[PDB]
Amino acid sequence: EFLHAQEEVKRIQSIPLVIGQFLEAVDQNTAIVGSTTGSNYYVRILSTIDRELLKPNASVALHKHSNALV
Amino acid sequence: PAVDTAEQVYISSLALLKMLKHGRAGVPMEVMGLMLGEFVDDYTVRVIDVFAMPQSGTGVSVEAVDPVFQAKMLDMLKQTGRPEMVVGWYHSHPGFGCWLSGVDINTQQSFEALSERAVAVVVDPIQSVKGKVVIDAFRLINANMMVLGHEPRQTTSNLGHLNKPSIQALIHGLNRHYYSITINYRKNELEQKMLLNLHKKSWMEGLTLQDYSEHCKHNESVVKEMLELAKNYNKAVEEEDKMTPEQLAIKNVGKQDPKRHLEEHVDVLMTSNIVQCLAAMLDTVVFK
Amino acid sequence: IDINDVTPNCRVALRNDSYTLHKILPNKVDPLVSLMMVEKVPDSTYEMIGG
Amino acid sequence: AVQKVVVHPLVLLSVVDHFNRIGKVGNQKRVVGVLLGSWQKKVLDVSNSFAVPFDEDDKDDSVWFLDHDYLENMYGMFKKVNARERIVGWYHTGPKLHKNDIAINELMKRYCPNSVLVIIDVKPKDLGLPTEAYISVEEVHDDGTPTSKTFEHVTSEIGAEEAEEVGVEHLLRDIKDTTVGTLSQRITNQVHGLKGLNSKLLDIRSYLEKVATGKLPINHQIIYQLQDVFNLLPDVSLQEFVKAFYLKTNDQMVVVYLASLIRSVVALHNLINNKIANRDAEKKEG
């Protein structure tokens, strides 16, 4: 089951992701991402990501449907 | 009388695949088709086959059911051996989730006119992009009984409240004008031993020794990164800061040095090396 | 969330479906004014200043 | 020609469903249907297949009725539903070819010049794919032998598209092995490959026995393909190869030893931590 869960987490990042700008991190497990579509969103950060890479304004790929940063 | 929340729309393995394929063909538009199955009893609606109806400018509406096409399709499928009745209809909701709009409700009522149990199915080919298959079965709630009685479905069992309504379906009219039906997937062996062949892995793949060049490169890279990680583990353990160590282990949790990037790599290396060596020896024995 | 905690210009977050507020979120700061806040302290110390 | 045939999962479930429904009411050996698919450069991609009424007499082997009008009407319906699919061949669930398959192949060629017969067995066999795409070849045989219609073979593989893949993943989420090379699955796969090699060698040996006893003809072709196989044997125990392979085995074993040392040290550290935690809890108890 753990292996299947890992595969699911990896499948969350599945290519067709909308690029967005990381605006500011509200707190771990969440952050504000400004989607390139032209609307600011509040999304849920993925745990596996590296917190160091989350610069004040960096390009973050967002899930196309759920809009969670992945 | 009343419909039990225990009713279960049985969707066969072929039906789900055909519905997904038809929905994915139409996107960016909306496809629709009639569902062939049996009303086996009051608490179950079994769908065996689903045949797409041709795309028409009308859309998914009562006029999308070309009577000549449906009649000829049923007549020709009867000869092959599928004398099934029309148990319901399905239409793809690209983008938006499984719910029913006004025209959808009108079409559902028209279908119900023929049979009181004509279930309606909604499939979204875009949401169902991964191990999740967003498929819902909906039927119309007599707005009359909304006041004449109360809710529309008896709850004689717990086989239905083991599921949850969706904000989307709730917003578009769920439990108000439309009520969902638990979708059970009727899968059997032969139809599950044939589908474990999409990726079955040939016997050869389990005797290929990889390539020793990139195998050595991978071993070297993993060993170097594990040396760096061992340096980090050394720093973390030798520190052993006792300023509330239970709190220290929780204030430095970031999926880092200690064990995560640790023995995870040990497992990767040892699995790869053991498998490669065993395959090499099996080849040295089997092939001469 | 209590209505008393939503002060004007608080940068709330709204649910996509019904647009209900479910968080307060940090107040918006103009991007360019954020860089002016000293997050990493400089290395200079008083003993380094002489005379 | 056809370099390869990709049979999408729906074709298989359709052919399992047709065989089941025909078998459930009445009894009929084999099940014949028309395969619909699109042509890549040379890789035929079968996506859908519809049943066609088909009565045959096993005794005569030359009596067989296949609907022409029914086939054309079904194809017209499917073209209305989706026109990207053109007829590309036929399938029959019969595990082995049949003497009348050539006439049916000609009838199919009447609708598609490049017809591929995919024999979709409905009996789960753990060793091998469930498809075998066949084509009709008329040649002069070169090697002074009588020529006949026969059935040339084309490689077959089962692929899928996004929708069919999602459906398959949902269907087999309870009997699916975890994706990732867990050592258990790797060792099991290696065992499976050994079993497949044994089965293939047994089949080859049975054919060789038949040829030697005369029950089957000496091909004069393909046989020398087996000879080439026997020439391509690794020839292990050569001194240079032995030294190189020992070097590689030791190079892998040193990494395995380092991994074992890391694992032992981590386990010992965890044991120390747990022991200290237990002792601290006991001391704080009183």
UniProtKB/Swiss-Prot annotation, chain A:
Subcellular localization(s) per the UniProt record: Cytoplasm; Nucleus
User: How is the quaternary structure described?
Assistant: Component of the 19S proteasome regulatory particle complex. The 26S proteasome consists of a 20S core particle (CP) and two 19S regulatory subunits (RP). The regulatory particle is made of a lid composed of 9 subunits, a base containing 6 ATPases including PSMC4 and few additional components. Interacts with NR1I3. Interacts with PAAF1. Interacts with TRIM5. Interacts with ZFAND1.
| Task performed by this protein | Component of the 26S proteasome, a multiprotein complex involved in the ATP-dependent degradation of ubiquitinated proteins. This complex plays a key role in the maintenance of protein homeostasis by removing misfolded or damaged proteins, which could impair cellular functions, and by removing proteins whose functions are no longer required. Therefore, the proteasome participates in numerous cellular processes, including cell cycle progression, apoptosis, or DNA damage repair.
Family (UniProt)? Belongs to the AAA ATPase family.
How is this protein named in the record? 26S proteasome regulatory subunit 6B
Q: Which species does the entry assign this protein to?
A: Homo sapiens (Human)
The UniProt gene name for this protein comes to PSMC4
Curated annotation (Swiss-Prot), chain C:
Where does the record place the modification Phosphoserine?
A: S18
As for subcellular location, the record says:
Cytoplasm; Nucleus
Q: Which residues cross the membrane?
A: none
- What assembly does the database describe for this protein? Component of the 19S proteasome regulatory particle complex. The 26S proteasome consists of a 20S core particle (CP) and two 19S regulatory subunits (RP). The regulatory particle is made of a lid composed of 9 subunits, a base containing 6 ATPases including PSMC5 and few additional components. Component of a complex with USP49 and RUVBL1. Interacts with PRPF19. Interacts with TRIM5. Interacts with NDC80. Interacts with PAAF1. Interacts, in vitro, with the thyroid hormone receptor (in a thyroid hormone T3-dependent manner) and with retinoid X receptor (RXR). Interacts with ERCC6.
Q: What does this protein do?
A: Component of the 26S proteasome, a multiprotein complex involved in the ATP-dependent degradation of ubiquitinated proteins. This complex plays a key role in the maintenance of protein homeostasis by removing misfolded or damaged proteins, which could impair cellular functions, and by removing proteins whose functions are no longer required. Therefore, the proteasome participates in numerous cellular processes, including cell cycle progression, apoptosis, or DNA damage repair.
Q: Which family does it belong to?
A: Belongs to the AAA ATPase family.
Indicate what this protein is called per its UniProt record.
Answer: 26S proteasome regulatory subunit 8
Species of origin reads: Homo sapiens (Human)
Swiss-Prot record, chain D:
InterPro entries on file: EIF3F/CSN6-like_C, JAMM/MPN+_dom, MPN, MPN_RPN7_8
Q: Give UniProt keywords alphabetically.
A: Acetylation, Isopeptide bond, Proteasome, Ubl conjugation
Listed GO molecular functions?
protein homodimerization activity
**GO BP terms:** proteasome-mediated ubiquitin-dependent protein catabolic process
Using the record, list the residue span of the signal peptide; answer none if the entry has no such feature.
Answer: none
Could you confirm whether the keyword Membrane appears in this record?
no
Q: Where is this cross-link: Glycyl lysine isopeptide (Lys-Gly) (interchain with G-Cter in ubiquitin)?
A: K176
Kindly list the positions at which N6-acetyllysine occurs in this protein: K200, K210
Recorded superkingdom: Eukaryota
User: What are the record's GO terms for cellular component?
Assistant: cytosol; extracellular exosome; extracellular region; ficolin-1-rich granule lumen; membrane; nucleoplasm; nucleus; proteasome complex
Q: Which Pfam families match?
A: JAB, MitMem_reg
> Which PROSITE patterns does the entry mention?
MPN (PS50249)
Where in the numbering of this chain does the MPN domain appear? 5-140
Oligomer status and interactors:
Component of the 19S proteasome regulatory particle complex. The 26S proteasome consists of a 20S core particle (CP) and two 19S regulatory subunits (RP). The regulatory particle is made of a lid composed of 9 subunits including PSMD7, a base containing 6 ATPases and few additional components. Within the complex, PSMD7 interacts with subunit PSMD4 through their respective MPN domain. Interacts with TRIM5.
Q: Which family does it belong to?
A: Belongs to the peptidase M67A family.
> Which additional comment does the entry carry?
Does not bind a metal ion.
Task: Please explain the role this protein plays, according to its UniProt record.
Answer: Component of the 26S proteasome, a multiprotein complex involved in the ATP-dependent degradation of ubiquitinated proteins. This complex plays a key role in the maintenance of protein homeostasis by removing misfolded or damaged proteins, which could impair cellular functions, and by removing proteins whose functions are no longer required. Therefore, the proteasome participates in numerous cellular processes, including cell cycle progression, apoptosis, or DNA damage repair.
Spell out the PANTHER family in the cross-references.
26S PROTEASOME NON-ATPASE REGULATORY SUBUNIT 7 (PTHR10540:SF7), EUKARYOTIC TRANSLATION INITIATION FACTOR 3 SUBUNIT F-RELATED (PTHR10540)
The name under which this protein is listed is 26S proteasome non-ATPase regulatory subunit 7
Q: Which organism is it from?
A: Homo sapiens (Human)
